[PDB]
């Protein structure tokens, strides 16, 4: 009914390994090569990646910035308001970034800020200035 | 023919 289990005999393959006298050994040489021409591909990338790994050697360890864990806050010191205005000029609407730069304001507070000081710190202008980049 | 086999009877392609 169907071949034996995992014996492989597709109509197509049959016709091709018979179409001539050596159409048998021909086909098993395209493959015997295709295979060696892929094992070499492998070792070549193995050798490339090995060299790329050696440049990544050391990690980013000597470039890591110690953990700063300071408590979030409610009042805007003039100092913090000024960080904000610059953070805005530089980061547009990325409230998370602005939040981290200021150090002690949550993403909502940062968002509130955008409304409470819209007129006073021309946040409209600042935003359309950051847009021109 | 297959029916001749005593040692290690072949099996393959027979219809049990």
């Amino acid at each position: 009914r169907k071949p034996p289990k995992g014996m492989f005999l597709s109509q197509e393959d049959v016709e091709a390994v018979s179409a001539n006298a050596t159409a048998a050994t021909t086909v098993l040489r395209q493959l015997d090569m295709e295979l060696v021409s892929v094992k070499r591909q492998i070792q070549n990338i193995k050798q490339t990646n090995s060299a790329l790994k050696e440049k990544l050697d050391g990690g980013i360890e000597p470039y890591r910035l110690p953990e700063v864990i300071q408590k979030c806050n409610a009042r805007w010191t003039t100092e913090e308001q000024l960080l904000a205005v610059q953070a805005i000029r530089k980061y547009g609407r990325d409230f998370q970034a602005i939040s981290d730069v200021i150090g002690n304001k949550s993403v909502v507070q940062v968002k509130n800020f955008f409304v409470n000081y819209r007129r006073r710190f021309n946040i409209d202008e600042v935003l359309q200035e950051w847009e021109a980049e | 023919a297959r029916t001749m086999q005593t040692a290690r009877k072949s099996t393959g392609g027979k219809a049990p």
Binding site: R1, K2, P3, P4, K5, M7, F8, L9, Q11, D13, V14, V17, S18, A24, V27, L28, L31, D32, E34, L35, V38, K39, I42, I45, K46, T48, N49, L52, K55, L56, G59, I60, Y63, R64, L65, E79, L82, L83, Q86, A87, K90, A97, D100, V101, I102, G103 | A1, R2, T3, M4, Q5, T6, A7, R8, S10, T11, G12, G13, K14, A15
Partner: protein, 670 residues
């Protein structure tokens, strides 16, 4: 099975259906109502059983009727027709039995039977017992033909037929109850033994052994599937052989082993290149980082106190530097994935080779075994048909005839007119009769002429095949017969008999294999048999080897024999043999081969063609169509039982029935 349905089975008949032959002698019944059929079938079956329960005494119509009950013994014309049919076709009272009704004194009809093979003998006895005048012409100085048994002192060993292939439904079963055959069962166990060139000859361990066999059978089925489902039967207007098909399959198994590996390393690269891309991203980011850290450093550095923009810088760069350290961290994560997903694939390779050099050598032994079974190179067998008689296999274990198979033909010869040393040279058949011209093998100018009503030709297919002819048909056989003759295969296999003064092999083991070094010689001495009481070891020469070994001297042959054996059992456990024989069946001019096989381009149907009798043209033109005159029996003539003794026996009975219907008339058919 048993009861009365055991009988039907042990006589190769369906216990509950009428066969085509029965329909022919009983169209009244089989075309009639179901009820009678069962009466018929029961009568048939009961008579069979009766005969079978006791095949040493003739079973007569009276004796039969006596043992039936109503409603069965009611109609007695039926019981008579049935009994007669069975008797006529050798289903009952065949072989060697005591007659109750000693032989009717003048005889009707005259038949010459060419050859006293089993087929010949089986026919002769039938015919004689039917009250005909029977003469057998035999070229050899003995009967039995291809049953050839070597005797000398206490050594007994067949160079011809050797195994009864299971008693279940086998006519030889009956014969063995009529004849002192010493039937020993053969135990299935068969260790193979690779000799390793000149190295250490060693057993094959139960592990390989089993997976190579398993693979072999897997490969056979493939060819069958390739044949019957894909219709892969003609290649270049040549028919495809079993050999070719096995090749094509093996190749596609090799091909696939490779398509496997290719996709496995193609998976390794497509992954190993996701890595090459990632490492790039990662090296470029460790740049951006290195340099951002510098920038942040330099801004820090600017000791306070600071205006707000200079303070923004420090903070800003700090954030940015942390952002990039998030990234380069998701990426060492991702790198962690791939790096092992690679150590995955690289540890699960798919299969290396399809079959090792050592594997394919054992596989060849299996191939030899097949070549032995068919007495021929697998390159010669029919793909579609080589195994066409499989349905008719017997059941039960195979057996050897311990006191030598010749015991059978000899016993059958008793009471018959057998002219030995007479070599038929010409067969002449005409509307009015037949003459057979034979010469004496010892002075081949001393001529004989035999006149008869009918000729039963049991010449070997090897013989019928001789070009130029050894037997001339006058007139020539018709194209339809002579093409069947060409198409059919007549193969060859040989035997080396070794006689020693001592068992030096495992007494309880009947068969063991030798696995040599090349495909080209897989047939050579590939299998050994230990069957007999005396210390005899017997070795097959099969396949392509069989033909080639025939032009090699006995000594040289027994040479390689002793080699292999010393190799297995130890140089000093294997003495010189006291007595040796080597069969040469292709060379033997009264055989010209061993037995038939379905050749590529033939089919089981050629076996039917072979058995078709010949009917001469009319003498005087315009005279009525004649009677048939030339009949054929023999192993090459029974499609359902080719190549065997029991097959031959059967064909004998077949013709003895057909000849009696023709020349004594068929009482039973009304």
């Amino acid at each position: 099975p048993s009861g009365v349905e055991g009988a039907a089975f042990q006589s190769r008949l369906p216990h509950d259906r009428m066969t085509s032959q029965e329909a022919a002698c009983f169209p009244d019944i089989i075309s009639g109502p179901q009820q009678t059929q069962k009466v018929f079938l029961f009568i048939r079956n009961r008579t069979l059983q009766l005969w079978l329960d006791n095949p040493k005494i003739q079973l007569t119509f009276e004796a039969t009727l006596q043992q039936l009950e109503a409603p069965y013994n009611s109609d007695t014309v039926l019981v008579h027709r049935v009994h007669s049919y069975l008797e006529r076709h050798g289903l009952i009272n065949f072989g060697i039995y005591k007659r109750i009704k000693p032989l009717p004194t003048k005889k009707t009809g005259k038949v010459i039977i060419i050859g006293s093979g089993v087929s010949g003998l089986a026919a002769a006895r039938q015919l004689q017992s039917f009250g005909m005048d029977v003469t057998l012409l035999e070229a050899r100085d003995r009967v039995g033909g291809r049953v050839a048994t070597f005797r000398k002192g206490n050594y007994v060993a067949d160079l011809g037929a050797m195994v009864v292939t299971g008693l279940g439904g086998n006519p030889m079963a009956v014969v063995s109850k009529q004849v002192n055959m010493e039937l020993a069962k053969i135990k299935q166990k068969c260790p193979l033994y690779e000799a390793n060139g000149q190295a250490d000859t060693v057993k094959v361990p139960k592990e390989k052994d089993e997976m190579v066999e398993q693979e072999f059978n897997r490969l056979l089925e493939a060819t069958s599937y390739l044949s019957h489902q894909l219709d892969f039967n003609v290649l270049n207007n040549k028919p495809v052989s079993l050999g070719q098909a096995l090749e094509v399959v093996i190749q596609l198994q090799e091909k696939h082993v490779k398509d496997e590996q290719i996709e496995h390393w193609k998976k390794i690269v497509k992954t190993q290149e996701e890595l090459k891309e990632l490492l790039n991203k990662m090296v470029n980011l460790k740049e951006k980082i290195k340099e951002l850290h510098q920038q942040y450093k330099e801004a820090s550095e600017v000791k306070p106190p600071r205006d707000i923009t200079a303070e923004f810088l420090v903070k800003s760069k700090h954030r940015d530097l942390t952002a990039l350290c998030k990234e380069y961290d998701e990426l060492a994560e991702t790198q962690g994935k791939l790096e092992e997903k690679l150590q995955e694939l690289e540890a699960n390779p798919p299969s290396d080779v399809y079959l090792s050099s050592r594997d394919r050598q054992i596989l060849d032994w299996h191939f030899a075994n097949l070549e032995f079974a068919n007495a021929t190179p697998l390159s010669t067998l029919s793909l579609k048909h080589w195994d066409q008689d499989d349905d008719f296999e017997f059941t039960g274990s195979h057996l050897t005839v311990r006191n030598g198979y010749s015991c059978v033909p000899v016993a059958l010869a008793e009471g018959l007119d057998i002219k030995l040393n007479t070599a038929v040279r010409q067969v002449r058949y005409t509307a009015s009769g037949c003459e057979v011209i034979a010469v004496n093998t010892r002075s081949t100018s001393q001529t004989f002429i035999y006149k008869c009503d009918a000729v039963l030709c049991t010449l070997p297919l090897g013989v019928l095949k001789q070009q130029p002819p050894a037997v001339q048909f006058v007139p020539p056989l018709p194209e339809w017969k002579t093409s069947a003759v060409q198409r059919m295969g007549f193969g060859n296999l040989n035997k080396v008999v070794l006689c020693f003064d001592r068992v030096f092999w495992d007494p309880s083991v009947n068969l063991f294999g030798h696995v040599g070094s090349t495909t080209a010689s897989r047939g050579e001495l590939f299998l050994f048999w230990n069957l007999y009481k005396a210390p005899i070891l017997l070795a097959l020469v099969a396949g392509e080897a069989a033909g080639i070994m025939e032009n090699i001297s006995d000594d040289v042959i027994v040479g390689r024999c002793l080699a292999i054996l010393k190799g297995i059992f130890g140089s000093s456990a294997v003495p010189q043999p006291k007595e040796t024989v080597v069969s040469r069946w292709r060379a033997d001019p009264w055989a010209r081969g061993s037995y038939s096989y379905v050749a590529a381009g033939s089919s089981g149907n050629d076996y039917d063609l072979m058995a078709q009798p010949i009917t001469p043209g009319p003498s005087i033109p315009g005279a009525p169509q004649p009677i048939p005159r030339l009949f054929f029996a023999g192993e090459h003539t029974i499609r359902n039982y080719p190549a065997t003794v029991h097959g031959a026996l059967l064909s004998g009975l077949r013709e003895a029935g057909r000849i009696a219907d023709q020349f004594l008339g068929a009482m039973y058919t009304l």
